[PDB]
Design a protein around this ligand. Structure first.
Ligand SMILES: [Ca+2]
Ligand SMILES: [Ca+2]
Length: 214
DNA sequence: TTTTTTTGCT
């Protein structure tokens, strides 16, 4: 009936303060709104062909399942580092240690974006930001993970210039697990390769911010 | 909220 956390309302050219969360995008938002004419094609062609094979209500249910399987997977690791997918990654967890961060936020003070990275930990003695994920079809080459490398280096560059973090990171790791328990493909990205993908991430970033001008 | 997940052949 009464407030428990009291604070008063008063205290004894027009302003237009922008809202930071509006003008500072998220990594996933930068990439999803700067997809290539090829990505849009195969994605639209994949939805039309899947809705035809499962209907509108079914394809909406499909989206729900594969979304939850992932989210539950990510949470499971968040607990472990503190199911069929878990058996698939067991041969990778043996090589991971030195966990410095999990489901933690990164903000780029200068390039002005933000994100939530899955994990920061040592893989075979190499500190990288790690990007877990489930997948139905197999992904044997880093090319099969599409924009995921960009998402990873966006997170790295953000952390390396986020004063909430006392350390830097130079490598990236994409782990693709499978429901049938097949071992997980580890797609590692050494410092040099992350510099390659980083340059391409700046392009997507700059394409996005130009898109937001109009 | 962010993120979860989704991508061909001739
Ligand atoms: Ca995530
Ligand atoms: Ca992930």
């Amino acid at each position: 009936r009464v407030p428990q956390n009291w604070f008063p309302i008063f205290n004894p050219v027009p302003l237009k303060i922008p809202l930071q969360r509006n003008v500072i995008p998220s990594v996933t938002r930068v990439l999803q709104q700067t997809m290539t004419k090829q990505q849009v094609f195969l994605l639209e062609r994949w939805k039309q062909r899947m809705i035809l094979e499962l209907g509108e209500d079914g394809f909406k249910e499909y989206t729900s399942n594969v979304f939850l399987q992932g989210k539950r997977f990510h949470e499971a690791l968040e607990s472990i580092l503190s199911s069929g997918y878990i058996e698939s990654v067991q041969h990778i967890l043996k090589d991971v240690s030195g966990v410095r961060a999990l489901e933690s936020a990164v903000q780029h003070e200068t390039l002005n974006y933000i994100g939530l990275l899955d994990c920061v930990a040592e893989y075979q003695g190499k500190l990288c930001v790690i990007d877990w994920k489930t997948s139905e079809k197999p992904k044997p080459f880093i090319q099969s993970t599409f924009d995921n490398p960009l998402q990873v280096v966006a997170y790295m560059g953000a952390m390396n210039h986020d004063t909430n973090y006392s350390f830097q990171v130079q490598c990236g790791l994409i782990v693709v697990a499978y429901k049938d328990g097949s071992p997980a493909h580890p797609h590692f990205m050494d410092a040099e390769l992350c510099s390659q993908y980083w340059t391409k991430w700046l392009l997507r970033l700059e394409e996005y911010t130009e898109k937001k001008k109009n």
